[PDB]
Amino acid sequence: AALLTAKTFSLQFNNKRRVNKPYYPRKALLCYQLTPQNGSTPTRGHLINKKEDHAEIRFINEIKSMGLDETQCYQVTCYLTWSPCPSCAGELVDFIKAHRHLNLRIFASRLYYHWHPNYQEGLLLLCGSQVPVEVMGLPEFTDCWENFVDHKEPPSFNPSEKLKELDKNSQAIKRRLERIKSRSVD
Amino acid sequence: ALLTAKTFSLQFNNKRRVNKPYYPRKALLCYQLTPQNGSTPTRGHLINKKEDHAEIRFINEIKSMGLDETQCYQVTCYLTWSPCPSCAGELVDFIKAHRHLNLRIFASRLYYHWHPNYQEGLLLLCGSQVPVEVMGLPEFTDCWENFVDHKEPPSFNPSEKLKELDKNSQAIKRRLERIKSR
RNA sequence: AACCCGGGGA
RNA sequence: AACCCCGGGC
Ligand SMILES: [Zn+2]
Ligand SMILES: [Zn+2]
């Protein structure tokens, strides 16, 4: 269970506004990439659980379990299917502020409760704390398909058609996040 | 039997989508049988079965009454969902063989109105002397007064509830008129 | 099936 | 929770 199946990628990163029939849960999925600055081999992994749970907290404890050398500098890229809840946003900020040897970027497929003010404040808290939050587009969806999906078996769908579909649906989501960031600068 | 005020509100709910918490909006049929000579009108309500829709049960219920076929009757049906094509065909065959009945159908919501076969069923009814219209403020009020139990007071304001149902009906009336173009 | 509102469906 | 597509949410 190291890499994701092509089916899991399609179903969980699905960024349509509404799940189609037959309905299935779009769970919280986190794909992370740890890239040391000195050029060591990057470490990759993913964690999945129900959206009500907190994959970001599991991600924090997974980073701590690696026993990283704090004299090195690390660039961390996180691909989320759902953007973080407000409590996880605060925990990520506190974690990154105490571990300044880590540089964290967050890419989200969907914006979790983006109409709710507390969830908006959580995303703004991350951006204001040197944790950039952006919406996944074609480059991010492609980078996730190449590095986190099992390619030994071909997918049932066309990978080029799926990535173009995900990028097309991302336009309205990127548009929504900029309206959130514009409202803070009032 | 009568409908509770809660059942009327929930089952005739004509919003585009059920709000949270979700509940099934199932097929409900309220009928009124009014003889021409002025006899006491007959009322009742019917719910789908696992194999018989409410319209088919309604057809069989009318036949079971042993109506005098030399009289004439006005029949009004308030439906929460508009008829499926199979029920539409059965209603037409029933009304053509029972010309002592005049049938009008009012629907709160249009059942699968984007499907061409379901549209043909509604047009078949209209073309077979069974006018199909969308329920508005008069129909919701007439159904509320004649089919709801008024012994127990509702938790909501009945006048406010009927205004909401009529407001939601405008987009549905609009949709049925687009269908009525051959 | 994260939530609401609005429009449409040859 | 009838379906699909689109737009928006101090
Ligand atoms: Zn969380
Ligand atoms: Zn039917």
Author numbering:
A (entry chain A): 1 to 186
B (entry chain B): 2 to 183
Lines quoted from the article behind this entry:
APOBEC3 (apolipoprotein B mRNA-editing enzyme, catalytic polypeptide-like, family 3; “A3”) antiviral proteins cause lethal G-to-A hypermutation in retroviruses and retroelements by converting deoxycytosine to deoxyuracil in newly reverse-transcribed single-stranded DNA (ssDNA). A3 proteins are comprised of one (A3H) or two (A3F and A3G) “Z” domains containing Zn-coordinating His and Cys amino acids that, together with a conserved Glu, form the deaminase catalytic center. A3H is an attractive target for biochemical and structural study because the single Z3 domain possesses all three biochemical activities: cytidine deaminase, RNA binding, and Vif binding. RNA binding is a key feature of A3 proteins that is necessary for their encapsidation into virions and for antiviral activity.
The pgtA3Hζ structure was solved using the anomalous scattering of the native Zn ion at the active site of the enzyme, resulting in a high-quality 2.24-Å structure. A3H has the familiar A3 fold composed of a five-stranded central β-sheet surrounded by six α-helices, and is highly similar to structures of other A3s in the overall fold and in the active site18. The A3H–RNA complex is maintained solely through protein–RNA contacts; there are no direct contacts between A3H protein molecules. Of the nine nucleotides in each strand (nt1–9), seven are base paired (nt3–9) and the two 5′ nucleotides (nt1 and nt2) are unpaired. The RNA kink is stabilized by A3H loop 1 (residues 13–30), which inserts into the narrow major groove of the A-form RNA duplex and includes a unique four-residue insertion (22PYYP25). The unpaired nt2 base protrudes into an A3H “aromatic cage” composed of amino acids from loop 7 (Tyr112, Tyr113, and Trp115) and loop 3 (Trp82). In summary, A3H is selective for RNA through a strong conformational preference for an A-form duplex with seven base pairs, but it lacks sequence specificity.
